[model samples]
Target chain A: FPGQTQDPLYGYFAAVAGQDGQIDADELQRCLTQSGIAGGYKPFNLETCRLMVSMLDRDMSGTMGFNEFKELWAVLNGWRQHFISFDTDRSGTVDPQELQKALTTMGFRLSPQAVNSIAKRYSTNGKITFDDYIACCVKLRALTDSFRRRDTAQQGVVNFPYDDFIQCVMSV
Target chain B: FPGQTQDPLYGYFAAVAGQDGQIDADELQRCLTQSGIAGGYKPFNLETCRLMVSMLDRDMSGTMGFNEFKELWAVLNGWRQHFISFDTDRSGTVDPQELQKALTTMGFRLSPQAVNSIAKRYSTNGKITFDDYIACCVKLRALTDSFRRRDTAQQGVVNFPYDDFIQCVMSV
Candidate 1:
């Protein structure tokens, strides 16, 4: 669900990428409901599911390619942001109020103003729309394309300034 | 590390914020190891840590804060990618001659020129060196950071790219 698209192979790939490496209904449900990846577009498909299964099998086989990445990325970014946009109430032009609220409930300390700032700056409208959200995702793809641009003085890029240098996330 | 530097109250207000609202040692350590606040700076005086611990002990509460987030990120990001850099001839740098033999063994289809090009492109100083191997990680980190950046884009000033997505070895 998180990374499938209208490409027709998305559902197929979703199902295929599961552990069993089969684009069947059962494996897909398991991954969609559980597993590491979750939330995206609705209306799944067999072809895309098969592709999901294929994606995994191919990847594990060490035959994955750059093109494959682009395909999967398109789906995930689209669906996930779709959910973020849908959660908005007011600022319909574009704040993902619903999704942001979820993160807050999870102990993510994003304040109301901070949330507004995110929606305001990132959203092209008052509320976050799916299309806008997807467009925003390009920032991620761009950064990934050029990760060296990261601010060495920082570890993360959280907008909220909670405190001073606490520790080292030490990822890279 | 990333663009932003220093965190909030994990300074004291962060973990110890709610309590008399200050930074104490116990609170700091708890935030660091237990809660993992302030990333992992190991603040001195740790007044924040002491306050947070006392507050928690008195309240018997388990409220989490940014400290917890820092800890989670640190743990996930701490792994290293030391083993992937390989030189076929046991040389620190991969030599073109040694590389040809490995590629030949792998049975890839390529022109000798192409093979030489790839080997040279991937290796430095006429051989592969463990030192620059981070270049491999840099490529991958940039890739994942791009994805993670999207996942946690603008939170505040801090971005927890490593907290969500990790590629290669320790590239969360």
Candidate 2:
């Protein structure tokens, strides 16, 4: 409340939670589509919200309230800082190599195909800003993570039903 | 039989497969324990054998005969090559950083915990050989991959029942 005006995500989080101070899966999913969190550039994937809850859920409550929401905000901003660090030229964007290094440093050891996908998705003239970087990172993390979950053998390959995979891709 | 002397794994492979050009689950399991492929460093896991057959079974025979076994040998050797590539100093071992770089290049995006487990497992005095590297990679790939499969949402975490996870781990 003290710095609500200064916080960009305050309104979005407030709208997503309840008076009891907790946002569940359904509510979080709804908020993703309605809120300006991704600023309309990010895809609304239920898996991303689920991961956010698990990452920021300190009490293992399977939900997030005000404090947790702030943590999520700070975490995203932390990536923003990383994006700044990689923008060596300070042109407000980072090249593909810089982005790759930044993502790897942040624990994103993506495969070549996934890396290529992100590079293609976010880059316009072969450079991406902080916003684009965050969007790509979140999407890659969610999608590869979803794919990995389907791989029971941990073989880096999944064999779920074709229709089910299509449904999963469409769900996001 | 002709080239068994040249290929160290030839004896082991020939001993494991059936006369009908296939190795059954039982034979493969027995070979895992008896084969010096891992040099008594690795434990017997049913899932690994299953993966091996499925991976090497070009004809979809659900088993590996002479040619399939050769293919498995080549694949594992490829991992060994990765280990060698990382051991640029020719110290005959790769450190944790080298191993991490090697795994990522080989398409392994392991979690921090799993990465730590691998580093500690193969490193006796802060160095891991090609054998140890292959063993660690194979095991981590199978075990972590199995754990992830239970999380349908790709949450990067699983919530399976406690005993079930223990069984899953032990079954490997």
Candidate 3:
């Protein structure tokens, strides 16, 4: 419960968050910039900043503490690679076909219709932006993670009261 | 729909997304860097990038066209202000007590249990990050908006099959 500082990302967030020990929008914006990934010279999107905070700020707190920051870093590291791999064109968009193939490759099979429905939310006319792709991936990831979490024994299937399971996905 | 470029924010996204009229992670990172924000000197967070795209990438397309970008901007603008108003200390974290007060002020009448339940999801060890606060607010806003949409006549009371309403909230 206390190894929060063992990681570099933790220090990154802690330093950015400042004396308050919590990371807010400005802090996040700063972290995004100073991290030096490439886009360190432009204005960060406030909306993007807000969304990042909300995704993991489960406690409704306006900032991420060390623990929260750590969780967020891990989530990001995993997704960055995944997003790049399936997003074949690097156009920041993924068509439904690509997504379908990716899902199959990842061992999660959805009817084309279900995948399409989710895809349709972000796709405009005929394109799926990287943002949409990420959203879809995140949603599926959460669902799959939930299912796996319930499979405590790792027997490959989970046994929850059906309503509870439905509630889990729907609540998300 | 047609005035996509009149807004400066739109222009920003459009330019960052590049000549392809689309934005992906790399493009967004570049945009963040050049946007003239104070922290443009740091590395962009990859997880933050994925979250940004997903929030507005409605069609599951991996990219955001002008329309999607505009919509995302609007959503973020609205939430940013709301998030700040209630975040009194600017601590970047909202305690459950603050949440209770904020919701009541916003005209939500929840049973202690109901608010408590939603509050619990974001609260880890008695703290709620700004991200969680935003999520709760957005969730509530969407639910409220849905109810308002059904109340097309502007009647104070909305009538629905109770089960449906319960299911709606639960699903949300």
Candidate 4:
């Protein structure tokens, strides 16, 4: 909040964009905590979040920016969409019978565990909707995007030089 | 140009909805084709456009009310977001390097040719802008949604002893 006045978009960014704008470990930890409330995953405690965020924030300057936030969102959402897309074969709900056939075709050739995982993820009151699938896609895409966006090999030169980065944010 | 009044939505549905309550394919097509004039997609042909319009119609119809229209808008808008989403690596244009790595990690390994296929689809002036990617996604998703909504799997029985058969259609 302190420096936000200098960047008029900051407050709105945080409120709407939330931890996504600063996706260091802290942001990620907070995400799960919030997601728990939103019913995605069990909430990570604040202390666990603090530790987890630190470990995840490879660059660890304590602040991440918009591009990082968005990239993560894209991958997570895309991954979830894959499952969601598969589940809604006819744009209709997946019955128990259909789910078994779909995973085989999808090549997941699951053990009962995989089916249970699928059941946990997709089945709500034993019926799955496209929107529910979309939500899962959102989470997976974001996680995958985060890993991809980082300079994982740590070759040190950033993918962007500063001017391009700033300009990129403004254009969006 | 001719028989504009013959468009299906303009006849019974428009009449039923009252004097005028729908946007026509002719106008929507014209709007998009005209947008192409601003160095958008050039030469948007007539037949292809009418296809897009019917696609949009089916989608809007599923949307039963004003609130549902808002929900429909979100799905339609998701396509638009794709165009923008592609520059996920944030190196300005679609980051081929990040994209290649990202796709591969997800097990969609691409040959150089395949990568180029993606780049070409999103490219404008050798740089795929956000708008370009989004337009492509919107068109594809609309078609995908249109196809799925046509399923009439569980129709007959006591609930439909006499039995009948049927179907569905989009966005800005």
Best by lDDT: 2
Clashing pairs in model 2, backbone N/Cα/C closer than 3 A: A154-B145
Mind giving the per-residue lDDT tens digits that candidate 4 earns over B1-172? 6645543222333332333353343444344443332133334333233334444444332113223223434544454344345545554446655445544543333356545555544444556544444343444444334333432442211111000110111021
Kindly report which residue stretches of model 3 are placed more than 4 angstroms away from their true locations once superposed. A1-7, A36-55, A58-62, A104-109, A139-172, B1-109, B113-172
**Cα lDDT, model 1, residue B54:** 26
lDDT of 2 by residue, B46-127 (tens): 4345546555556745566766666766777677677767888877678878887888889766444445545543343457
Worst 10 residues of 3 chain A by lDDT: A36-45
True contacts kept of 2: 0.00
RMSD, one per candidate, in order:
20.9, 20.3, 11.2, 23.1
Question: CAPRI verdict on model 4?
Answer: incorrect
* Weakest ten-residue segment in model 1 chain A by summed lDDT: A163-172
Which number leads on TM-score?
3
For model 4, state the Cα shift of residue B158 in Å.
Answer: 31
Q: List, residue by residue over B9-36, the lDDT tens digit for candidate 3.
A: 6656766766888897567656655653
Where is the poorest 10-residue window by lDDT in model 4 chain A? A163-172
What TM-score quantifies how close candidate 1 is to the native fold?
Answer: 0.22
Docking category of candidate 2: incorrect
TM-score of chain B of each: 0.25, 0.61, 0.55, 0.39
Q: Rank the candidates by lDDT, best first.
A: 2, 3, 4, 1
